[PDB]
Design a protein around this ligand. Sequence first.
Ligand SMILES: Oc1cc(O)c(Cl)c(CCc2nccn2Cc2ccccc2)c1Cl
Ligand SMILES: Oc1cc(O)c(Cl)c(CCc2nccn2Cc2ccccc2)c1Cl
Lengths: 216, 214
Amino acid sequence: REKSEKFAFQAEVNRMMKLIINSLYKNKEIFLRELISNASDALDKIRLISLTDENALAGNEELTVKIKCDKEKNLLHVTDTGVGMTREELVKNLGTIAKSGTSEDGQSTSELIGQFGVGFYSAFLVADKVIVTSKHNNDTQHIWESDSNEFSVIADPRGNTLGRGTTITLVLKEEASDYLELDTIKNLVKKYSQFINFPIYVWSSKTTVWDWELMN
Amino acid sequence: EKFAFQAEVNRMMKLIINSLYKNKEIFLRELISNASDALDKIRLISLTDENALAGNEELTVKIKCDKEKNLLHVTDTGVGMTREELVKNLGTIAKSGTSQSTSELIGQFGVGFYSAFLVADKVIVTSKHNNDTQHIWESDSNEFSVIADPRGNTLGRGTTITLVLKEEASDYLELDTIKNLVKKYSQFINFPIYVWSSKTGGGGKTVWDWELMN
Ligand SMILES: Oc1cc(O)c(Cl)c(CCc2nccn2Cc2ccccc2)c1Cl
Ligand SMILES: Oc1cc(O)c(Cl)c(CCc2nccn2Cc2ccccc2)c1Cl
C-alpha cells in the first residue's frame, strides 16, 4: 500500500497553478492553447487506433478541428473529430469534479490533472461554465456541464450530431466577450496552431458569406 | 478597479482549490504541512553545521487559539524566513500603497496561502531566520507591509502564522474541535505538534499548557 500518489497529485497541482497564474499575468490565452492541444491529442489518438481497427473511421473520415464563434449568444465552440468520450470517461472527467449534489480503481487523479487540469481550470479565466459534448464509438452521445466544482451529465437530445469527437463549449463571461471578435480569434488560432499536423478551421466571412477557413 | 490583478488571482485560487479539495479545512492541513517543511529544512541543515539550532534548540509546531480576539496561531521553530523572502512572499500581492520567478512562487505556496482566505480575512507572518532580524509581515491578499519587530528576536528561530478569521469560521477556535482536526491532519508528521489546551489537576482553577497530539 504505497499511498504516495498524494505527492504526485501535489506536484501536478503545483505545475498547474504555476502555468495558470503565469498566463494570467500576460496573455490569459493558455485556455486556447490547451483547447487546441487536447483536441490534437484526441485526433492523434484515434488516428493511432485506426492502425489496428479499420472500422474506427466510420462516424467521420475527416480529421479536423473546427472553431465557431456565437457573438450574439457569447459562446465559444471547439469541435474535433477525434476519439471522443464514452459516458464512463465523462463521469471520471479529470478525477476532481464530482456529481451535482454530492459532497460526502482506474487511471489516477494525478495523471489526469497532469494532462487535463490546466486546460480545464484555465477555461474559468474567461468562462463561467464549460460544456462538453462527445461521442465515442460503442457508446451514445452525451453532454457534460461543469461550474469548476460539480457536474451533471445527460444523453444528447439531438442523438448523434458529431459523428465522432468532441465539442467544447465555453459559456464566456461578458468581460471576455472580446475573445469572439473574429479577428482576435483568427490570429490566436493561427498562432497556436502552426505546429498541428491536423487542419484547424475558424468559421469566417468574405464579400457576405460564411464558410470554414484553414489556419495552418 | 483598484486591485484588479489581486482580485483575479484570489478568484482563481479559491475556485481551483475549492474544486480540488471540497473541504474548507484544507487551510489547516497546509498550515501544518508547510510548518513540517520548515522544520525538515532546518533539521537537514543541522546535520552538517553543528551549531545551526543555536537560536532555538527545539523542533516543534505549537498551535494556540484565542477565541477571545478571533485569532489562530501556528508557530514552528523551523528554518524561518529572511526579510527578502518575506518581501518576495508569493509575488502576487502588491506592496502597500501602489497605484517567471513570481509564477514559481505560487507553485510552491499558493495553495497554502490562498486557502487561508477561505477561512480568514487577514494573515500575519512573524519570522526569524538564522542571520537576520525578525520581521512582521501582514496581508489581506491585496496589499502587504513588512516591518522590523519592535519586540526584537523573540522567536530565536522560526515562524508564526496568525489568521484573523472571518466571522463565518469562528467555530475553528473552540478548543474541543480544534484538537480534533489537528489530531486528524497531523497523525503522520515527523515532528511534535502541541495545542494550548486545559486540564483540571486539583480542586480549583484550570491550567493551560502544551498538550501533545501525535
Ligand atoms: O479540449 C478537448 C478536446 C477533446 O477532443 C477532448 Cl476528448 C477533451 C477531453 C480530454 C479527456 N479525455 C479523457 C478525459 N479528459 C478530460 C476531461 C474529461 C471530461 C471533462 C473534461 C475534461 C478535451 Cl478537454
Ligand atoms: O505556514 C508556513 C510555515 C512556515 O514555517 C513557513 Cl517558512 C511558511 C512560509 C513558506 C515560504 N517560504 C518562502 C516563501 N514562503 C511563502 C510565504 C512567504 C511570506 C509570506 C507568506 C508566504 C509558511 Cl506559509
